[PDB]
Structure 1
Amino acid sequence: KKIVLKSSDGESFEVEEAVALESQTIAHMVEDDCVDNGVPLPNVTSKILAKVIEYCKRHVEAAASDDDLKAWDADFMKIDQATLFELILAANYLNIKNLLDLTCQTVADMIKGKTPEEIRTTFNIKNDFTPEEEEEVRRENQWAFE
């Protein structure tokens, strides 16, 4: 069975039936029937949809040796900040546990060993703590600074 997926911009993608069961939300929709036309995904970008399509297709193809998948998912993560954030959001939305786990592991690895100075430069975030509260929290975690 062939399934047509429609993106927000208007692009159409063709997917298979066995890979559809990988997304348990789509499986839950399927067992309740009431699905004849292409399922629309409003708040999803097209390129992220293509990327997750490639990921799931490769995973099901490989599943049907561990070093091979380790190398493949290592090579997959050669994307910048924006693609990583979009992929994390998509994995949250369609609820694929493996992709979300991999993305969160990658982000945890790249934040590992950082300092309250390095993290703010990494993510370009605004420090909203006053000197008093900042000194307080630094003193609370002072054991980590030695």
Structure 2
Amino acid sequence: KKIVLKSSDGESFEVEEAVALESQTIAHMVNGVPLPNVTSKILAKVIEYCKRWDADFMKIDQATLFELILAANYLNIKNLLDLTCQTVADMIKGKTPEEIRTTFNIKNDFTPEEEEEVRRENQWAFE
């Protein structure tokens, strides 16, 4: 028995019931499954992951990564969410505050005095 999943683009995907059970959002749904929050491009990647290294699977551009985080969370796939979130953490590791800002296109919202307050707080922990 094989179950059908619908993306936001309209397109449909046929998957094994073992594969779709990996999403706890899908498992809760009791013709076929509409997923208005997941595009075809991203749903294909989810399905590919749900076939049961993944270091290769994570060799994607930044936009796709964050869309995959949103999908993994909208569906309830703990392992994919963990992998995608660990990958973002690895991007943060080893970067200066400016390099972090540049990578994720973050605006510095700190006052000069707030910045020094954070710095002074950080001093209370060994590195």
Structure 2 portions without partners, runs of 5+: none
Deviation for aligned residue 1:125: 0.6
Higher helix content, 1 or 2: 1
Give the greater-gyration-radius structure (CA).
Answer: 1
- In structure 1, C-alpha distance between the alignment counterparts of 2:48 and 2:59, rounded to whole Å: 14
Cα 1:73–1:16 change in 2 (3 A) is same
Give the corresponding residue for 2:15: 15
Structure 1 portions without partners, runs of 5+: 30-36, 59-71
- In structure 1, C-alpha distance between the alignment counterparts of 2:27 and 2:118, rounded to whole Å: 46
Deviation for aligned residue 1:2: 1.6
- In structure 2, C-alpha distance between the alignment counterparts of 1:110 and 1:144, rounded to whole Å: 23
Output the TM-score relative to the length of structure 1: 0.78
- In structure 2, C-alpha distance between the alignment counterparts of 1:7 and 1:22, rounded to whole Å: 17
Deviation for aligned residue 1:143: 6.1
Does structure 1 retain, via aligned residues, the 8 Å contact 2:37–2:71?
no
- In structure 1, C-alpha distance between the alignment counterparts of 2:23 and 2:63, rounded to whole Å: 23
**What is the SS of the residue equivalent to 2:115?**
helix
Deviation for aligned residue 1:144: 7.1
Matched, 1:133 2:127: no
Q: CA RMSD in A?
A: 1.9
Post-superposition CA distance 1:46-82 (Å, at most 9, x none): 1100001111124xxxxxxxxxxxxx21111110101
Cα 1:21–1:145 change in 2 (3 A) is closer
